[PDB]
Symmetry: D3
Subunit: 255 residues, 6 copies
Amino acid sequence: ANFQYIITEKKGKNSSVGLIQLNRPKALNALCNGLIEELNQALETFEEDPAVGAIVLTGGEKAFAAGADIKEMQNRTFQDCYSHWDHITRIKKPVIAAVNGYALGGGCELAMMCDIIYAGEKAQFGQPEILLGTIPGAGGTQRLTRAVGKSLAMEMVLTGDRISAQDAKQAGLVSKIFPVETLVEEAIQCAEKIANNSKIIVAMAKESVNAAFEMTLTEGNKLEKKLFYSTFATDDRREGMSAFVEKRKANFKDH
Amino acid sequence: ANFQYIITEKKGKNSSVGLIQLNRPKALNALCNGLIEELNQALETFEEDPAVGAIVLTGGEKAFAAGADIKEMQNRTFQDCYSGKHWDHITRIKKPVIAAVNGYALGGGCELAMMCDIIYAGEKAQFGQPEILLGTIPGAGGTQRLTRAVGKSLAMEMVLTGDRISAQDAKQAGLVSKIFPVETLVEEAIQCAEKIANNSKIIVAMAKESVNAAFEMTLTEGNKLEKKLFYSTFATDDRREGMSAFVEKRKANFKDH
Amino acid sequence: ANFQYIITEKKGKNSSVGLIQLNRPKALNALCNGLIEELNQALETFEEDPAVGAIVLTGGEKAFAAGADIKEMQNRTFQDCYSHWDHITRIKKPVIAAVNGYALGGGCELAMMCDIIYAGEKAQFGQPEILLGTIPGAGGTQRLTRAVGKSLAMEMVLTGDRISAQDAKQAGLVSKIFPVETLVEEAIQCAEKIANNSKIIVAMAKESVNAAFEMTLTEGNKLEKKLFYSTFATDDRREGMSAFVEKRKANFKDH
Amino acid sequence: NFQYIITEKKGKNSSVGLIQLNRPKALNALCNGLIEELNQALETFEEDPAVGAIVLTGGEKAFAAGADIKEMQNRTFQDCYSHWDHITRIKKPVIAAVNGYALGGGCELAMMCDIIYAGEKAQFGQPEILLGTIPGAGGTQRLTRAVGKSLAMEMVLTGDRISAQDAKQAGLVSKIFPVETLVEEAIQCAEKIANNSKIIVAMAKESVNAAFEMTLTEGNKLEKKLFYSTFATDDRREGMSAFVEKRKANFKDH
Amino acid sequence: NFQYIITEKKGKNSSVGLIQLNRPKALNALCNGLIEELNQALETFEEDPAVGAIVLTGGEKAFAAGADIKEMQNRTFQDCYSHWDHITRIKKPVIAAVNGYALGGGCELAMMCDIIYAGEKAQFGQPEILLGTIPGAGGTQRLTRAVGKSLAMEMVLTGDRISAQDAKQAGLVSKIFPVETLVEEAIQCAEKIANNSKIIVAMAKESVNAAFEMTLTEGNKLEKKLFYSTFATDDRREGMSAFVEKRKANFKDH
Amino acid sequence: NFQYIITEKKGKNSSVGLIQLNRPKALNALCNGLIEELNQALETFEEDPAVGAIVLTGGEKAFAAGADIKEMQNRTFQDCYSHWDHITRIKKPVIAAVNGYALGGGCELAMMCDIIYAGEKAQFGQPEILLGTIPGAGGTQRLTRAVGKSLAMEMVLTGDRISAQDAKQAGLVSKIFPVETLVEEAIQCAEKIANNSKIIVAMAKESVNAAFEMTLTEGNKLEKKLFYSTFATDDRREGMSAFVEKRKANFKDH
Ligand SMILES: CCCCCCCC(=O)SCCNC(=O)CCNC(=O)[C@H](O)C(C)(C)COP(=O)(O)OP(=O)(O)OC[C@H]1O[C@@H](n2cnc3c(N)ncnc32)[C@H](O)[C@@H]1OP(=O)(O)O
Ligand SMILES: CCCCCCCC(=O)SCCNC(=O)CCNC(=O)[C@H](O)C(C)(C)COP(=O)(O)OP(=O)(O)OC[C@H]1O[C@@H](n2cnc3c(N)ncnc32)[C@H](O)[C@@H]1OP(=O)(O)O
Ligand SMILES: CCCCCCCC(=O)SCCNC(=O)CCNC(=O)[C@H](O)C(C)(C)COP(=O)(O)OP(=O)(O)OC[C@H]1O[C@@H](n2cnc3c(N)ncnc32)[C@H](O)[C@@H]1OP(=O)(O)O
Ligand SMILES: CCCCCCCC(=O)SCCNC(=O)CCNC(=O)[C@H](O)C(C)(C)COP(=O)(O)OP(=O)(O)OC[C@H]1O[C@@H](n2cnc3c(N)ncnc32)[C@H](O)[C@@H]1OP(=O)(O)O
């Protein structure tokens, strides 16, 4: 429906890419509860849209998201905490984060929840939760550490210091850096490529990669094998291999 | 043995390095079932050869291995796959295995290199997991070892698009530890295998087992296992000789015992 | 007490940083049992000193620590061993390692036990245990691998080869590289920053980041959440978020 | 309102939310519609401040004979690949009062509950194998973890059923009561849980569940963090003071 | 053919692969030669399309009294660090019919089996401690996971034996039968399993085993993936249809 | 020189270190001072070359009624973030002879022990919930792992107690003895253990403990490494030889 905090729209060839834009410039995209609710709606919608194969999440040019909404948490109590934030992780289709500008606190964690992260030349990542007398509460101490290593993760989480796009890429937090002006376009091109592939196979691949963080290498490889065997129960695997053998373009039907 | 797809031979000082070279150039070293069987044979042989301390696995200059053999699985069914189950044997080898990757190391080829303990890349090597382009996903640790070495963002990008990354990219990301000119790559990998072979076999096997454990348990339990293995080295003659040699300011004489 | 192998002292703004300096220059700071005992004492002392918020551990300019003391284990037997080295991991306050020069074997492991590692331009890391007929025995095969990746870790552990500061940073083993002359000063500045934040919250954050190596991503995020909720039971969380909302400097009380 | 389930509050001061599966015709076979209502009832009781614990039960002859086979009969692999365990998202304790058949999906639903009380004639089993499939809702995970590999393999591979007595001896269920008083007894247990601090009860339940998600070392660390957390509540202060002051504790779920 | 074991096809349609340890003089002490033949028999039965389940047993006096001490007596540490668990690579179900002694390596072998049936006079134990060593084939892992820490510690640290009734009560074994009919009963169970779809049975067995290799959360996710997989088979379709059409299922193992 | 505990060496050759909690007035409430002495006694017995196993017990009426409520009553959340399980750092086996009450911290202490023997009238429980808190020393972890989720949830959420018979049936304790002979019997078991090689016993105990810290696969690998290690000891050679030579083994703890 008519969204208050986000702007959605389909893009790329055949409009196969679902674009979600955080639109709360006043608050530098502070992830207030309302914005989160709309974001989850947009994600669910694009997830159920058969023409969409990949989603691109972005914010403004100055800020992807400055964090969660302090104003909204300010008066919460411990007990409140014990009486929605990671719905993006339940989405089966790939989600690419096009990070331009600030991606701090909850904003940084939201980007890390995405499968792939592309950063604009002037993006900035950080977990300033410590400066607010709290710690990251949406995977900031988990996903950051796993991607960047203990030393840098400890430095960022304990001081609240920010790192550049170049630092993030070097550390493995993000895989590409693009000029501010073309960042979103480039992320859409990548989303396109992914959308071109079979949707069912892409979902299986994404699930396999994610498993790398939930089990031992041994069990991860076993799960990957089971999923690999599964692709053989699909038409697109048959079509993909035949196309290869027949040296012709493959025609995937997401089935 | 009389191999059809691979070329083996001992190299390095005292012929301590076992060199296995994938040899199916017309198929750019596509890993067909027959080649896999010979590779495993060569590995087992070098493993049982007491003169060998480390193995170097390589392919051609244009390709380490362009991938599994699609033509061989193109007709398989789900039931075939399940009710039919050896791609991972190289992981059962106790001696270190170094992959000297020159050119293409894609799909199964990339996974094979990642199964190796160390990876050295030639200036023009290329890594990628194009399984997605074939309507399938990596099936030999491609989504596990790549991710663990390269991080989620790059791993997702590669696995989901099938895009390739350069040798420089792979090194920067931690997939490979060294990059050498195409012409000297294999020589350099042999030098490293030699250094490793110089050490005590038994101790080297324990160390390799310890490092591998870093991917199978919590840091806490990993450190405990490492401790047990560390204590174990004290039950060997080489440990004694090694420390004695250092204290006595003289060269160590290891006997792999 | 009056230490024989280490030099301690408080530094940074308001002497909030506890500096421990390994001082056995003749043995290139080889980690003998006596030095380890003093180091543990210094750590415990700084841990219990209310004025200290972070500790900086360093050695000489030529060597952080050349390794454990070989002569001391030279005559030990397997039964000796099976029937203290990592107490530094029991410290709740952050510990930063300012590595200048050699950080080999036990020295490298000690540095890796620290939360953050800063390296001087000429630092060198390596695990030469293999050259002595033994393997790293204080997390060298675990922390190195987890930070540097399997390929480089195997190369280092199996050959005993050393890597440069630049290599270590690129691989994620250390997060910063500074000139030899200012390295310790820079690490103290980082410790200062950490010490200005809430001690209790900092301890929780450090615990959260460390958990990234002890459980699946799913459970790690759950633990992080519980710790996040916990911060709400503190005065500093309330002051931190209030200060932000009221556009004013936060005054933490480590409570 | 509900077509497949019957809900109602019970116990002291109506602190117990009782959900009763009601599709006697199909022996409470868990069809998609019933699952949707069950989840609703659960969410409702979860949000009801008056409720401290939930009791889930079915009929006297069957808790739930299994998922609805006719509903999946024609599904294909792609349909599948493209919530039956929402009960696991509930923070308040859920007790399963199993009378009669608790097979397949029914057995898995009971195992998803925190506590299981079985009527004298209850029967547990995972017959999915007889249908050319395997348990798909934790049947091979929760059963094994509670009963051990030998018995779990026997049940899953043959589809054989085990008695209430077997289930109790194996640790699948913690109590066995006469068919007629089973539900009443489960409600008494839920009452007791409801009398304790909700916030503390939620933390304890989360701690016990963690025993299946991490190593003992990390589990103990998490438990410690939760233990420290209780000190941030009024109920913990009240509970310990009441003890020291030899008086009854008055919890406020805060 | 074989020196230490006796194999033969049993059960309806010869669907059961029976392997019998045959080293009576050494009370089936698991020497290296016997292990090699056992692995051969397993591989053979595994590749035999007519076999759906394997039953492993020994004599009436002893399933297997332990590894062969004589064989390791002279080994050194270095020797040790320079295929005991092959039975674990078999995809088809393996039932252990334990009669008499199942000690040390013998106990571990039985524990490696998916299901364990014990004769009235079976005896389990891990006496490795009495020999100056510890169980080296999962004795401290599988025993503990099945029996609990207290009893496992007692057995491993003292070398004490437990009865068939103790083993069953503790969950080590799921059934106890008279010595004379034990093997027959295990074959009947193997028959039942063999009757079901081989591919689905292999998936189920893999799912149950996963209960010991990952957190409940990941185990449930793996089980789900395998569950979806069954939908890519003809047997699942046949199984569910047969139920719906109230008729007998004809599985074709695919 | 102990105020809260009574120690003394018992059994053949004074091979068993017996520690008796002695604060009958407080039903052995584990106050901080008692914990400090307990740890001292443990460390002492651990360093005593003549001791091979420790037996921990309390009074006939109570092993330990819990941690000291009076001592934590005034603690704050912040205090909590400013050596309760040191018994777990002891390499030699520790047997808990539980007579009477073993509640809360007391129950957790018993569970930290390697083996638990219970007197006919022992009682186990985790009443932390009744005090507005949750078990904080492994009560939700070790209890669950030994007793299963259903019973563990029941105990932790209601604070209800279970009998010795219940505890044994659930696997929490491995033996039940009359109140009067319980400690004697536990000492006999400690004797047996102390009979074997101390170095090998330490390795075995470490192996069994690993069953709760890693996947079955890695646990088996660790066990293997420990198994190989035993071959680097004289006691293993002595043990195997003694068996081969049909003679009694003479262990020298190395
Ligand atoms: C499960 C539940 C979730 C838990 C997850 C983890 C916890 C967190 O995410 S906490 C968030 C951490 N983020 C922060 O501390 C960042 C706060 N913001 C900043 O530091 C600055 O805005 C910064 C550096 C990005 C840019 O500074 P600047 O260019 O001067 O812009 P600035 O004027 O501060 O911001 C503009 C407006 O956005 C608002 N805003 C910015 N960030 C936030 C935020 N995180 N919450 C609420 N409002 C915010 C500002 O208050 C201001 O509004 P106004 O002037 O009307 O009060
Ligand atoms: C349970 C606890 C677990 C144990 C943990 C794991 C095991 C380990 O840590 S073993 C450590 C491995 N490290 C080594 O072998 C490195 C030894 N050091 C070196 O090789 C060199 O000192 C190096 C390369 C750093 C610098 O070279 P260089 O500048 O020429 O110095 P160099 O002349 O070799 O040595 C100078 C002095 O330092 C001493 N020293 C340096 N490292 C050590 C050491 N590890 N042990 C003992 N003495 C040492 C030397 O003995 C020598 O003293 P002296 O002349 O009186 O005999
Ligand atoms: C993530 C997605 C979830 C995945 C989870 C795992 C998979 C599963 O749960 S599959 C379910 C396994 N369950 C079964 O195979 C049990 C099927 N039922 C039975 O065996 C018998 O009903 C039994 C033994 C319980 C009782 O027999 P009986 O007393 O004769 O009663 P019975 O006549 O069979 O049942 C009465 C009615 O209930 C129906 N019914 C019973 N169970 C089911 C069921 N599971 N699905 C659908 N309808 C069922 C019967 O079809 C019959 O209806 P009708 O005669 O109009 O067709
Ligand atoms: C890491 C930090 C550790 C965290 C671990 C987890 C948390 C816990 O352990 S909390 C402990 C939970 N235990 C309890 O709630 C049990 C409390 N006690 C009881 O319920 C009863 O004493 C019971 C049922 C055992 C016996 O009742 P009864 O026979 O009437 O004896 P009772 O009169 O109550 O006890 C005798 C004396 O011992 C004292 N006492 C008993 N238990 C405790 C205790 N846990 N703490 C302090 N004092 C205690 C009583 O206060 C009384 O002393 P006094 O009359 O002078 O004040």
